[PDB]
Subunit: 244 residues, 4 copies
C-alpha cells in the first residue's frame, strides 16, 4: 500500500485529505503542531478501519534554525512507519493580517512565510532526497492575484508556494515526481461574516466543503493524473472570476 504525509492533518481540510487518502488505500502520517488530541483521535479512527495504517508526527513548521531537521523528521517518520513515502501534501498554513501601516514582524515572517512556503520547500527537498506514482500536492489560494486587504505576508507566502510548485515540478520531473497544487477559494470558515463570504460564490447554491478540496487532491495523486505536473487546480466555485 502506498503512504502519504499530510501536514496540518488534525482538522478541517487536512483532516478531510488524510481521510480520503486513507479511504483510497494509503497509509498516512498525520502531522500536527498544537492539535495532538485531534491528530491522535483521527489516527485512532483510521487504525480502527485498518490496523497500523495511520501514525502521527509533531512538528512546528515556523521557520527557524531547526526547521530543516523538523521537515526531514516528518518525511523520515513516513519511511519508518510504512517503508516508503509516495505522496506529500503541503496543507499546514498560518493565516492572519499583517498591515503595512500602523508578535514582532519577524515572528510573522517566520510563521507566515515558514508554514506557507519554506516548510513546503524543505519537505519537498527531504521527500525527493529520500526517494511508482510519486507526487506532491501544495495547498495554494485561488485568490492569490486578488489578495485580501492587509494580508501582504500571507499573500507573499502563497505566491512563493506557486513558485515552488512550478520550480519543483520542473526539477523533479526527471525523478518521476509530479508536483501540483489545489487552490481553494472560500472553503471552511473559522454567521453574518460567514454569509458575506458565501454570497460572492457563483456556484454558491452548493456548500463549500473540505471534501471537495480533498477530491481534487485525490485526482492529482491518482493514475488519472499521471501526465499532470506543475498544474494548480482552482476549487473555488468560480469566485476568482468575479470582478469587484
Amino acid at each position: 500500500a502506498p503512504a502519504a504525509v499530510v501536514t496540518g492533518a488534525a482538522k478541517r481540510i487536512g483532516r478531510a485529505i488524510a481521510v480520503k487518502l486513507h479511504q483510497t488505500g494509503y497509509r498516512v502520517v498525520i502531522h500536527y503542531h498544537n492539535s495532538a488530541e485531534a491528530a491522535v483521535s483521527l489516527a485512532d479512527e483510521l487504525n480502527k478501519e485498518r490496523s497500523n495504517t495511520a501514525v502521527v508526527c509533531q512538528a512546528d513548521l515556523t521557520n527557524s534554525n531547526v526547521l530543516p531537521a523538523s521537515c526531514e523528521e516528518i518525511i523520515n517518520s513516513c519511511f519508518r512507519a510504512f517503508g516508503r513515502c509516495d505522496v506529500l501534501v503541503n496543507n499546514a498554513s498560518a493565516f492572519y493580517p499583517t498591515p503595512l501601516v500602523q508578535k514582532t514582524v519577524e515572528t510573522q515572517v517566520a510563521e507566515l512565510i515558514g508554514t506557507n512556503a519554506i516548510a513546503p520547500f524543505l519537505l519537498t527537498m527531504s521527500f525527493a532526497q529520500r526517494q511508482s506514482n510519486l507526487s506532491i500536492v501544495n495547498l495554494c489560494d485561488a485568490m492569490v492575484d486578488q489578495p485580501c486587504m492587509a494580508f501582504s505576508l500571507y499573500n507573499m507566502g502563497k505566491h512563493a508556494l506557486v513558485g515552488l510548485t512550478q520550480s519543483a515540478a520542473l526539477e523533479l520531473a526527471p525523478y518521476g515526481i509530479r508536483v501540483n497544487g489545489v487552490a481553494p477559494g472560500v472553503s471552511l470558515l473559522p454567521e453574518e461574516e460567514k454569509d458575506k463570504w458565501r454570497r460572492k460564490v457563483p456556484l454558491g447554491r452548493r456548500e463549500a466543503s473540505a471534501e471537495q478540496i480533498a477530491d481534487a487532491v485525490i485526482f492529482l495523486v491518482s493514475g488519472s493524473a499521471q501526465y499532470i505536473t506543475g498544474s494548480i487546480i482552482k476549487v473555488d466555485g468560480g469566485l476568482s472570476l468575479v470582478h469587484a
Copy 2:
C-alpha cells in the same frame, strides 16, 4: 436513466478517447464529426456493440458562417432526439494550421476562429437554452507561449479561455459548470515525420513523451464527475510540465 454527452470532433484521436471514456463511465454519446464519417460510424458501432442504443453520429461543419448557429443548435438537438437529455458538452473539434502575418484569409478566420471559439460559444448557448451538467473546452497549455506563425489559431484558443471563464460565471446560476483541459503536446499528426515528432517529445519534462489521448480524456472525466462539483472556470493543464520550460 443514463446521462448523455456531446463530443465534437469525436471520430479520431483525443475526441475519440473522450467519447470512449465517457461511454465507459456510463454516458450515452453523440459522436460529432465533419469529414471522418467512416471513423465516426465505426466508433458508434463499437460503442453500441457494448450497450445497444448508446451512441449516435452527428455530422456538421463548425466553420463560422451565418448557418453556424443553426448547425450548433442541431448538434444539441441531436442529443435530445437520441437520448432525451444532454448533460455534458465537450468542445474538442479544432482546426490547426499556420497563418503567417507576412484558402482566403477570411476562410482561415472562419475555420480557425469558428472551430476553436465561435462554435464552442454557440454550442454553449444551445446547450444552456435547451436545459450534474457541465461543459469541458479543449484548450491549449501553450496559449501564452504560442507556435510561430499560428496567430489565428492562438487567437481562437485565447478566445476559448475567455468563453470558459465568461460562461462559467453566467451559467453558474443554472447549475452548469464550465471548465477546460489544456494539452501541451499530445497526439502528433499522422503525416508528421518521425524526427519532427521526436523534437516535440524531447520538449516535455515529465517523461520526454507526448500525452496519450487517454491521459487527456482522464482530465475530462474528472471535470464532468461528482468529484469536481465545486470546480467551475478552471483550466487543467495536462502538459507534463511543458508550459513551465523557458526558451
Copy 3:
C-alpha cells in the same frame, strides 16, 4: 521626416486622446472612424490648424466580413498615401455590448470579434507587409474577471491578447514591437446615470475615479517611444488597481 501613425476609432474618447498625444509628440496621424464623421473631421481640422498636412481621416467598418481584409489594407495604404510611411498602428476601435448566453448572433460575432480581434489581426498583417516601428493594442484589464453576459466581447479581448503575443513573437525579426494597454475603468458612457458611474468609480483603489483618456494615451506614448525599445509582447494595465480587487 516626421513619423506617421494610424489610430482606429480615433474620432472620440480614448482614440481621440491617443491621436492628439501622438500628434503632440510629432506624429502625422490617420484618424480612422466608422460612424463619427463630423467628430473625425473636426479633429483633423484642429490638428492641421496646429501643423498643416499632418492629419487625414479614413472611414471604414471594422465588422468582420469578406471585405474586411481589403478595408484594413486600405487603412494602412491611406497612411502611406498621405505621409509616405507608417510607423505606428494603434488598434483602439471596439464594439462593446452584452450578448447573453440564455441583431442576429452572427452579426454580434462579426461586430464584437471583428472590431476587437480580426480587424487588429488584418491591420497587423497589412502594417507588417508594407514595411521605431510598433503596434499598440487596446486591451482590457478585466479580461480574466469578465462582465456578466459579455461573453463575445470578452472572447474578442482575449483573442486580442493572443494576437499581441503572437505578433510580438513573429514580427520581432522585422524590428516591429507589439504591445498592449489595458484600461480598467476609463471614460464611462455620457448617458450612464451618475449613480451608476459612481458604482464603477468606487471600485477603483487609486483615487476612486476612472482613468482619463489622456492617462490611457500616456501609456501608448510610452510604448511607441524610444524608452520602450526592448519592450515587446507586454500589456500594461492602466487600471488604478481595479484588477487586483476581489469580489
Copy 4:
C-alpha cells in the same frame, strides 16, 4: 524642491543605471549598497560633481534576520536625513544563485527570500510609515513562471515579490502611493560568465537576439515613477524582448 529616491543595490549594473537616470530626471538619490563600497562611493562622487549634495550612500545587509526591520527603517531614514523627503523607493537589490532540491539552507533562505521579498516588504512598510507623486518600483523577473532549473528559492522570492507588489498596491492606494514592477528577461549577464554562455542567453531573445541594456531597464522604472504613470498601480511591465513568450 527636488524629489528624492532610494535605490537598493545601486552601486553597479541595473541599480546604478536606475540611480543615474533618476538623478538625470532631477531626483536626489540614496545609493544603497552591501559589499560594493568603492563602486557606490565612485557613483555618488560622479552624481555630486554634476549637482552638489544630490547623492549619498547607505550601507546595509538585506539578508533576513531579526535586525532586518531596523536596517530597512534606517535606509528610509537615511533618505529623510539627507534630503528631507523620500518620494520613490526602488527595490533592486537581489541575491541570485542555485539551490538544488536534490552556505546552510537556512542562510540561503535568509539571503534569497530576504533580499528578493522580505527586505522589499519591510522597506515598503517603512516608506509608507514615514510619509505629490509617491511610488515604489520592484525589480521582478519576466521568467517567474518559466523558472531556471535548480533556482527554487530565488524563484519563490521573486514570486513573493509579485505578491507584495499587488498587495501593497491595493493597501497603499488610499495614501496615494503607487506600487509597480519592472520585470527584466535577460539583461546584464554576470561579469564572471563566459562569452559562449552569455551568447546562449542572448540567442533566446526574439527582439534583437541580445540582452537588455541597463538603461533599457531603467527607462521602464523612470516611466513608472513619472506623471505619465499616475493611474498605474499594481502593474508589472515586462522588459524582455519577447523572451517570456518563447516556447520550449
